[PDB]
Amino acid sequence: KPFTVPILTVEEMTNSRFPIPLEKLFTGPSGAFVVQPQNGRCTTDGVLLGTTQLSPVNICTFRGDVTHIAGTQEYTMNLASQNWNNYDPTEEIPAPLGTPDFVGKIQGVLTQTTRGDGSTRGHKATVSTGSVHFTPKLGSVQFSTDTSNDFETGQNTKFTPVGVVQDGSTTHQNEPQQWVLPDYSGRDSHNVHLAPAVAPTFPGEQLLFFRSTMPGCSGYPNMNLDCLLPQEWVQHFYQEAAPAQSDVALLRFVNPDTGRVLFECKLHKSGYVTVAHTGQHDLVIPPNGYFRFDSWVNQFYTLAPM
Amino acid sequence: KPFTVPILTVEEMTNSRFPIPLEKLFTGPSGAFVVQPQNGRCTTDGVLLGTTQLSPVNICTFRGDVTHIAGTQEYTMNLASQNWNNYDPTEEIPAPLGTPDFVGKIQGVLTQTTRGDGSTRGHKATVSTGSVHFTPKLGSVQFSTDTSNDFETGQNTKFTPVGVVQDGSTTHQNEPQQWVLPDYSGRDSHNVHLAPAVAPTFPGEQLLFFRSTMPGCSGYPNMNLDCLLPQEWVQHFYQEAAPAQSDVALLRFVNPDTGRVLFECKLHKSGYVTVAHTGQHDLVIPPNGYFRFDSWVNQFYTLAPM
Numbered sequence: 001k002p003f004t005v006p007i008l009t010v011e012e013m014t015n016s017r018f019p020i021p022l023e024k025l026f027t028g029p030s031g032a033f034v035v036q037p038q039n040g041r042c043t044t045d046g047v048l049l050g051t052t053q054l055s056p057v058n059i060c061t062f063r064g065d066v067t068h069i070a071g072t073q074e075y076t077m078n079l080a081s082q083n084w085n086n087y088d089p090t091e092e093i094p095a096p097l098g099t100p101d102f103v104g105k106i107q108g109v110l111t112q113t114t115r116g117d118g119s120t121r122g123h124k125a126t127v128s129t130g131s132v133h134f135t136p137k138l139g140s141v142q143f144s145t146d147t148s149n150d151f152e153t154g155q156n157t158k159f160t161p162v163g164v165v166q167d168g169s170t171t172h173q174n175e176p177q178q179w180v181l182p183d184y185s186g187r188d189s190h191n192v193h194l195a196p197a198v199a200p201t202f203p204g205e206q207l208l209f210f211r212s213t214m215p216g217c218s219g220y221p222n223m224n225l226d227c228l229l230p231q232e233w234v235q236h237f238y239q240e241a242a243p244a245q246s247d248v249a250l251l252r253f254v255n256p257d258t259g260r261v262l263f264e265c266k267l268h269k270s271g272y273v274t275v276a277h278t279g280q281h282d283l284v285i286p287p288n289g290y291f292r293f294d295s296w297v298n299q300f301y302t303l304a305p306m
Numbered sequence: 307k308p309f310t311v312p313i314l315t316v317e318e319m320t321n322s323r324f325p326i327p328l329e330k331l332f333t334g335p336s337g338a339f340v341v342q343p344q345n346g347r348c349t350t351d352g353v354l355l356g357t358t359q360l361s362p363v364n365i366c367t368f369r370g371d372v373t374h375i376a377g378t379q380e381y382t383m384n385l386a387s388q389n390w391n392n393y394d395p396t397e398e399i400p401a402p403l404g405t406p407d408f409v410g411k412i413q414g415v416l417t418q419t420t421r422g423d424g425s426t427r428g429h430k431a432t433v434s435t436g437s438v439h440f441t442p443k444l445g446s447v448q449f450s451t452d453t454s455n456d457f458e459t460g461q462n463t464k465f466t467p468v469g470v471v472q473d474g475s476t477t478h479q480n481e482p483q484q485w486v487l488p489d490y491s492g493r494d495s496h497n498v499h500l501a502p503a504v505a506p507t508f509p510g511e512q513l514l515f516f517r518s519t520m521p522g523c524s525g526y527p528n529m530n531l532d533c534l535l536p537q538e539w540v541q542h543f544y545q546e547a548a549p550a551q552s553d554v555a556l557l558r559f560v561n562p563d564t565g566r567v568l569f570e571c572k573l574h575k576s577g578y579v580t581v582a583h584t585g586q587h588d589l590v591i592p593p594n595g596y597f598r599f600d601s602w603v604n605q606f607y608t609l610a611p612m
C-alpha cells in the first residue's frame with residue numbers, strides 16, 4: 001500500500017501538542033535540551049506512541065470528579081477517561097492519552113453539570129504541570145480556580161484549555177518549558193513508556209518543527225509550541241497504515257502555483273522530520289505549499305540544503 | 307477515483323459544530339424544526355458549504371481587534387479571517403467561516419499579546435448570538451466580559467470557545483436553540499448564501515445525527531449538539547475529492563470485531579446521512595464500530611430497517 005502524507009497546507013493543519021492551528025515551519029538546534037514530546041507521536045505506518053490520541057480537541061483536556069481543598073480556591077480532580085469510564089493506571093502508557101507533555105501553567109475553564117437537574121457552572125482554572133500535585137499517571141491533578149465554593153462532588157467536571165500564563169514579577173518567558181516533560185507520577189517518580197527522544201543524526205541536519213504560538217492569558221509566557229507531526233498527519237497515518245519500505249521517507253515541499261520544489265526533508269518512519277539546516281529559522285513558504293512523499297531512502301541520504 | 311469515508315470510530319471523531327468530541331449517534335423525526343446548520347457542511351466530493359472550514363479548533367472561534375464600549379464591560383470585535391487576513395463582507399458566504407450556527411450564549415475567553423515585549427491578557431467573555439449586536443456578516447460581534455479597562459485596541463485578539471450558558475429565565479433548557487440560525491447581519495438583512503436545509507425524502511427515513519454534549523457554564527442550558535457530518539469527514543472529502551457516481555452512497559456500520567453489519571445508511575452526495583427508522587432513538591453501537599462505503603446506489607434503494 002503506497003505511503004502518502006496529506007495534501008493539507010501548514011495553515012490548514014493543527015498542532016498535535018495543544019488545540020490550536022499551525023502557523024509556520026521552524027527549524028532550530030536542540031542545544032542542551034532533549035526533544036521528547038509525548039503528544040503528536042506516531043509512526044508512519046500508524047502506530048500511536050507516547051500519550052498520543054486521535055482527537056485534536058482532547059489535547060490538554062481533563063475529565064473527572066473534583067473535591068475542594070478546604071480554605072482554598074484549589075480543587076483535586078480524580079481523572080476519568082475520555083468517555084467518563086474509570087482511568088486505568090495499569091495501561092503501559094506514560095499518562096492518560098492527551099495529557100500535557102510540557103511543564104507550564106495551562107489556564108482554561110473548569111465546567112461541571114449536576115446530573116440530577118442539569119444545573120451547570122464554570123470557573124477559570126489553571127493546572128501547573130510542574131506542581132507536586134500534578135500526578136495524572138496516578139489518576140489525580142490539582143487545579144487553581146477563581147472559586148472556593150461553586151463545584152460539587154460526584155459530578156462530571158471537564159477542563160478546557162485556553163492558553164498559558166507566566167508570573168510577570170519573575171524572569172520573562174521563563175515558562176512554559178516546552179521540552180521539559182512533567183513527572184507524570186509526581187515528585188521523585190520516574191516516567192515510563194515514553195516515546196523516544198528525537199535528534200538529527202546526519203551531518204548538517206536539524207529537526208523540522210510544526211510551530212504554533214499558544215495564547216497567553218497573563219504575564220510573559222514563552223508561547224512557542226513545536227510539534228513533530230501535525231495532528232492531521234497522526235490521523236492520516238493511523239488510518240492509512242501504509243508499511244514503511246525503509247527508515248526514511250523523502251518528502252518534497254512543493255509550490256503548486258509553479259510546481260517547483262521549495263525544499264526537501266526526511267520523514268523518519270518513527271515519526272519526525274529533519275532538514276539540512278543549522279540555526280534558528282522560520283521557513284518562508286507560499287501559503288498553498290504542501291508536502292509530497294516522493295521516495296523511500298536510507299539514513300545516509302544527503303538532502304539538498306535548505 | 308474510489309470514494310471512501312474515514313475508518314475512525316464515532317468516539318475517535320469530532321463534532322463539526324463545536325470543538326468537542328463526538329459521543330454517540332442519534333436519529334429522530336425532524337419536522338419540528340428547520341435543519342439548516344452551516345458548520346459541518348460539505349459535499350461528498352469535497353466542496354465546503356455554508357460557513358464550514360477545515361480546522362476543528364476554529365469552530366466557534368473568533369479573531370479580530372477589540373474596542374471597549376464606554377461605561378460597560380462589553381467589547382466590540384471587528385472580525386478578521388481565521389489567518390488574520392481581512393474579512394470581506396461581500397464574499398458570498400453567510401458569515402465568517404467557523405461562525406456559530408445556533409442561537410445561544412457561548413462562554414469562552416478573549417486573549418491578546420503585545421508583540422513589543424510579549425505581555426499577555428486574558429478575560430472571560432460571552433457572545434450572545436441572538437443579540438442585535440451579533441452581526442458577524444457585517445464584520446462585528448459583541449462580547450460581555452469581566453473587565454472595563456484591560457484590552458488593547460488595534461491588536462490581534464482571539465476568542466476561544468468553551469461552552470454555553472443559560473440565563474434570563476427560570477425556564478430550563480430553552481437555550482441554546484441548536485436548529486435556529488442566528489441573524490448573521492442582525493436586523494439589517496436576512497441570512498443569505500446558506501447551505502440547504504436538509505430533510506428525509508424517502509419513505510420511512512430519518513436523518514442520522516452525530517451527537518455531542520456541549521459543556522455548560524451556567525444555568526440550565528440545552529447542551530445537545532447534533533451535526534450532519536463529523537469534522538473528520540469534512541476534512542477527508544476535501545482532500546480526496548472523489549467524484550460522486552450517483553446522488554446516494556450506501557454505507558454500512560460495521561463491528562470489526564465480529565465482521566457483522568449493525569445497520570446501513572445513505573450518505574447523500576450533498577452531505578448528510580439518513581437511516582430507515584421511525585421515532586427518537588439513541589443508537590447502541592460497539593465502541594469499535596465504524597462506517598464503510600460499499601456502493602453508489604440509485605434513487606430507489608430501500609434501506610434495511612435500523
Ligand SMILES: C[C@@H]1O[C@@H](O[C@@H]2[C@@H](O)[C@@H](O)[C@@H](CO)O[C@H]2O)[C@@H](O)[C@H](O)[C@@H]1O
Nearest residue numbers: 119120121122150472473523524525526
Ligand atoms: C444554575 C446555577 O448556575 C450558575 O450560577 C448562576 C450564575 O452564573 C449567574 O448566571 C447568576 C444568575 O442570576 O446566578 C447563578 O444562578 C452556577 O455558578 C451555579 O453553581 C448553578 O449551577
